[PDB]
């Protein structure tokens, strides 16, 4: 019958590894690099679009950085279509929480929920996992600014600075070298762009190959503002930091 054609997506290897999770991680290692850096006065999200074209409409394009709500955003590394499925589910989860408790969802609770969905696909259902790794940048009044990552296994961890996608080994070493705890957003912006500039597989890092975002309390008084950078604004920050 049908058994013959079943790949069995949810089985251990003899070494105790999940084949499909490992192979999904291999897929993600070829995706454009995404970097998150947490500072005392905000968070930076920086990400490289994959070998683009001059005819691509950049100002209306979004493949890396997505808004989950007013307080939480994500950087994507992997299959964009898979990511959008999960992103929509996360957006709904945040709204369900807001309706139930009349308070914005704490960052970790959202991250745990999405990570649990990923986990389910590795244990039951016989379906392939989502070939997506997220960096979550968010703020709540309990822990303040937070960075998380999740991968196809459904495992998630918290970070001060982190990278996903291509050349994470090189990127993480560079971040580990220059990151400090008392760092500020403007410094983190520079670190993120410098790290991408060195780890990129492209010849040079330009505005049309980047997506950029910040989460700042640089919102007038006791509130948080998300800023998805426009193409011209990415071009300006590249000149300001002295990369172009």
């Amino acid at each position: 019958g049908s058994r013959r054609y079943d790949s069995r997506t949810t089985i251990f290897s003899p070494e105790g590894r999940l084949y499909q999770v490992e192979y999904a991680l291999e897929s993600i290692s070829h995706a454009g690099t995404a970097i998150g850096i947490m500072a005392s006065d905000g968070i930076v999200l920086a990400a490289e679009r994959k070998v683009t074209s001059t005819l691509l409409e950049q100002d209306t394009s979004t493949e890396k950085l997505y808004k989950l709500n007013d307080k939480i955003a994500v950087a994507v590394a992997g299959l964009t279509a898979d990511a959008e499925i999960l992103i929509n589910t996360a957006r709904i989860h945040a709204q369900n929480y807001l309706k139930t408790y009349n308070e914005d969802i704490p960052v970790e609770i959202l991250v745990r929920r999405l990570s649990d969905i990923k986990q389910g696909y590795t244990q039951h259902g016989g379906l392939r996992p989502f070939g997506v790794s997220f960096i979550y940048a968010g703020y709540d009044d309990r822990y303040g600014y937070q960075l998380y990552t999740s991968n196809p296994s459904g495992n998630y961890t918290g970070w001060k600075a982190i990278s996903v996608g291509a050349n994470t080994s090189a990127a993480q070493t560079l971040l580990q070298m220059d990151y400090k705890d008392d760092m500020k957003v403007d410094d983190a912006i520079e670190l993120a762009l410098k790290t991408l500039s060195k780890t990129t597989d492209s010849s040079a890092l330009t505005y049309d190959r980047l997506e950029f975002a910040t989460i700042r309390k640089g919102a007038n008084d006791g509130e948080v503002y998300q800023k998805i950078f426009k193409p011209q604004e990415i071009k300006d920050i590249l000149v300001k930091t002295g990369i172009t």
């Binding site: 949810t10 070494e15 105790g16 970790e108 244990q123 495992n155 580990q176």
Partner: protein, 240 residues
């Protein structure tokens, strides 16, 4: 629905999916449990391959199931969350219907039952997780420590370890733990737990977590400095 029998017997009478789930536990960071005369201590290894980690928000290795019971684990981190959630729901369900919090044995029996179920249900794989469940029964001062594994078998232990290099730390515990006289104080119990992890851990810095559970819902996690003082005192006695 997906109904495929993933966990099945082999000619030699082995269920490889359950055995391969144990190999996932072997890969997981080391966890250790030691019960004194009036306490239980849960020690956990943190691999220092991951720095730049935010330790405030990163999922802690020891989890409260109720105010009086805790659960640590070795193996797949994502898998452990599902068991922890189910255990927490069952703990509240027990309080709601029986009007009494779970015993440590009951909670263990439940978690172990969930694990077993996933070894002979269609379309699911076993949990790649072994757990150490510790605490005190309501209105009881006798320490409790149990262990579960992917197959769903569970048992009580005076002291036990799971995860990578658990063979080595079990070796240590077997020669250092005396049943006739268990660690009489919190200090002695924590010291023996830190000592057991120092056989395997590497640096005694942020690699060792310690959680102390005492009777009547008295649970506290030791800080870096508090643990560092144990690490310091152990090696200074060793230089002799």
């Amino acid at each position: 629905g997906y109904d495929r029998a993933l966990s099945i017997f082999s000619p030699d009478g082995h269920i490889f999916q359950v055995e391969y789930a144990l190999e996932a536990v072997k890969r997981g960071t080391c966890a250790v449990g030691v019960k004194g005369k009036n306490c239980v201590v849960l020690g956990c290894e943190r691999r220092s391959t991951l720095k730049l980690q935010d330790t405030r928000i990163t999922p802690s290795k020891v989890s409260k199931i109720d105010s009086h019971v805790v659960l640590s684990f070795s193996g797949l981190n994502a898998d452990s969350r599902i068991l922890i959630e189910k255990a927490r729901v069952e703990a509240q369900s027990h309080r709601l219907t029986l009007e009494d919090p779970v015993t440590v044995e009951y909670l263990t029996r439940y978690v172990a039952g969930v694990q077993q179920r996933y070894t002979q249900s269609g379309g699911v794989r076993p949990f790649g997780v072994s757990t150490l469940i510790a605490g005190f029964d309501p209105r009881d001062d006798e320490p409790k420590l149990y262990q579960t594994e992917p197959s769903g078998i569970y048992s009580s232990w005076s002291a036990q370890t799971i995860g990578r290099n658990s063979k080595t730390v079990r070796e240590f515990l077997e020669k250092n733990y005396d049943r006739k006289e268990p660690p009489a104080t919190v200090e002695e119990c924590v010291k023996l737990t830190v000592r057991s992890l120092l056989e395997v851990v590497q640096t005694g810095a942020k690699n060792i977590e310690i959680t102390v559970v005492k009777p009547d819902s008295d649970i506290v996690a030791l800080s870096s400095e508090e643990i560092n003082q144990y690490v310091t005192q152990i090696e200074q006695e060793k230089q002799e």
